[PDB]
Symmetry: C3
Subunit: 341 residues, 3 copies
């Protein structure tokens, strides 16, 4: 039969930006923003049937479901149909990319969408997405699991099914994980010979306004540390690079940026203090060191677990972006509540 | 664990408007409108977990779900997360305003959206809404319960989190209820030092087209009668007032209107005849008696209860709005069916 | 109490169009389109309560729920409230038209929306729809069942409830079915004295851009064969006609087209090979034989049933539309998977 599940999560977030360019007030100070915000409440349906020969059918329909009433849609979170057996798992649908699944071991902070960059490691998680795709996941081979994912060209670009006037945006995603004696280490990455980027280095759909076409787009993520014995610690290294593919005098010219992230948390019975640091390095844009993309952020917080499904959350965030006169410093704090059903 | 619930309700409504200004036909008569209409079918999910120390976690996700297929969205009806214990209730989310909860004791008629003004006391219920908010509800103190609700400034106006260029639309909502020997009496009200209104005296979001900015916006509702022993009777008094806050020669100038409503119903086993009268008084707009907002409406109807969850509904509505040559008279009737699950 | 149900279905579809007018490449050949596509996954809620006197209350809320995340809305598939007893069934809501219910015995192919015309008998199913309506279904009288359905004028045209400036789009739908010794034969049809059509002969809402107003719009469907003993066979005949109702020199001038469809399938235990042919005849448009609407399509495929709720699907489609130089040939194939819960 079928299972219903979800997570409800919300809280109040206080936030303050200090931007020289956009803010009248002396110092460049914006005012306090005091807001009730949903942290991405979701609700889902999933089922499975045994087909007899050690093989199951699997499906999921998960949805964003903010308790502030700002969401609509079915299947807009990870949703699929698939088969599972001795050979492993195959799914097709609106699937978490391999790099998005690796978020658990990198970014565990709960946040409003307005504070996902300051109160969470949102910047390093700008390469996570959901894509319509087929995906394979291997069984666990003595602590080793792996996965491979592919986005078809015509799933990447519907307009051009029958007229390949635009280059293919087909993308490959792939991952290898190792867990043993609690210890964890994994590689996550993606490649697209052709892709498109926004100014925030997030990938955007082909034909989005102000999108910059790129070639040989590739992301590399590596995480390790581990998760057991009343303690968590992880570190992650992320590398991303592409080449300019906008005709003009910059075409073929090389983009890249390197990010690192560090998180540690220790559990005192029902209280789990946590700390996270992240660094966005110097960015090379069009083969030119560009300091606008460099950043330093630190998050501190803790979770009180009333039960194994209900937590209280608190956290504070410091974020500095760029260098020089065009600097943006974000500070925010939160108190919140979460329920998993 | 988790509960699923809802209400399905629909029927056919006949309606006829008699407006001098908008209608060609002699008398000013519009034609019969004969329509199948949803009366606001809804579907919801709610759960709760005991946290041990006489304290529960609570959540809800409720949605409009018209069986005519005109709704989309999650959490667009009362949805929240909260905590309940000996101290009472605290919720945060898309919450019924305190004045919206008081609708049960004032307006109990089921209706299409097109007939909510004639086949229900819709006019007096123009001050009911749902707002993103924190809300406290007191335990029942020997028949006395109370509640307090607040909308943050930055929840009232997202655009201006960091630039308080516009005045705060933060609002307070508050209520006191007393139930005893069946007898009921309650006060419901709200205050916003700054708010915005449409031409129909409904509150609208900041920056809505043709919205009139107001100051010291305050609503006052009072209801009493009671509900037991095969009989219901209630009466309600509503007062609303603000000051013009549109720069120009009218600013600071005073708005107000007073409404009264009366309902009685007696139950003959499985049939519950009901009657309702409402009066919208002379309106003072910009300190000037304005008769356009005055109205008189009467509703008569009954409910046959096939079961405690399935009812048949019938009702007829007479509505007269304004005075003079610019008069609008609405007549409508309905037959319907409702199922609570 | 209440039931949850649905169907999850998706697969990969390959498709190729060969159009002289729209395609550069020599032959007129478009390129392969290789796509992951949802075949119309849906999810629904339904319940019923006994009212005692051999009579039940019934409701449904069904929704499109593509696992590619492209759907939003509640009640956008067949949703209703109703009563059922010895006398039969009455429903009111977003109801399947009588002709849409007859699709099971005519078109059983699962498909993406982009391939519903080639990998399914989509063309003959251009007269199926869901309309806000009241509907009666008769009990089975010795193999005979019948149904009647009506769309109110003001449900057909909301804008004009009170100003009948536009002619009524009220429509009647009606059907008679006979099942016995497995044998099945049924009549399905609809009539609207006034209606509107798109260029693809699909009915569109009043005031849709490029809609052609028609009068005496009527559809006639007839199906027979039968469904038992390890074998299925059906044949269907469809007739549709109207008169031009666009003022201009063509008004009153007569439209019509005749379609026929043929399907046979035999079950080899868990494998059900199937074949379907369909023919769209010469069309008379404005009383003028027009060959653009003529077509010939054939589908071959089979279903492997892992269980009684999980199937694997395969099919291939050939479609030729029109005659002459303005000819469109579509070829497509699919492999897919379906789960009914």
């Amino acid at each position: 039969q079928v299972t219903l599940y979800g997570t409800i999560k919300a809280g109040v977030e206080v936030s303050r930006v200090k931007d020289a360019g956009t803010y009248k007030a002396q110092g460049g100070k914006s005012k306090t923003a005091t807001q009730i915000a949903d942290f991405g409440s979701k609700i889902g349906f999933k089922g499975q049937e045994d087909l007899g020969n050690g093989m199951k059918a699997i499906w999921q329909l998960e949805q964003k479901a903010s308790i502030a009433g700002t969401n609509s849609g079915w299947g807009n979170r990870q949703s699929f149909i698939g088969l599972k057996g001795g050979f492993g798992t195959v799914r097709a649908g609106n699937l978490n990319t391999v790099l998005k699944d690796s978020k658990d071991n990198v970014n565990a902070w709960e946040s409003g969408s307005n504070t996902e960059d300051v109160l969470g490691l949102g910047t390093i998680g700008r390469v996570e997405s959901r894509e319509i795709s087929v995906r394979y996941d291997s069984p666990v081979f003595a602590g080793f699991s792996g996965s491979v994912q592919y986005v078809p060209r015509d799933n990447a670009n519907d307009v051009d099914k029958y007229k390949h006037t635009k280059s293919s945006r087909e993308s490959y995603h792939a991952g290898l994980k190792y867990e043993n004696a609690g210890f964890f280490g994994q590689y996550a990455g993606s490649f697209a010979k052709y892709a498109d980027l926004n100014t925030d280095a997030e990938r955007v759909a082909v034909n989005t306004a102000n999108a910059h076409p790129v070639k040989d787009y590739q992301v590399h993520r590596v995480v390790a540390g581990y998760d057991a014995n009343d303690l968590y610690v992880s570190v992650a290294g992320q590398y991303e690079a592409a080449k300019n593919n906008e005709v003009g005098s910059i075409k073929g010219k090389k983009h890249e940026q390197t990010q690192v992230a560090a998180t540690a948390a220790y559990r005192f019975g029902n209280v789990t203090p946590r700390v996270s640091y992240a660094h966005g390095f110097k960015a090379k844009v069009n083969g030119v060191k560009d300091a606008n993309y460099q950043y330093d952020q630190v998050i501190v917080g803790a979770d009180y677990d009333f039960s194994k499904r209900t937590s209280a959350l608190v956290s504070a965030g410091w974020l500095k972006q760029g260098k020089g006169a065009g600097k943006v410093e974000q500070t925010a704090s939160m108190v919140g509540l979460r329920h998993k059903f």
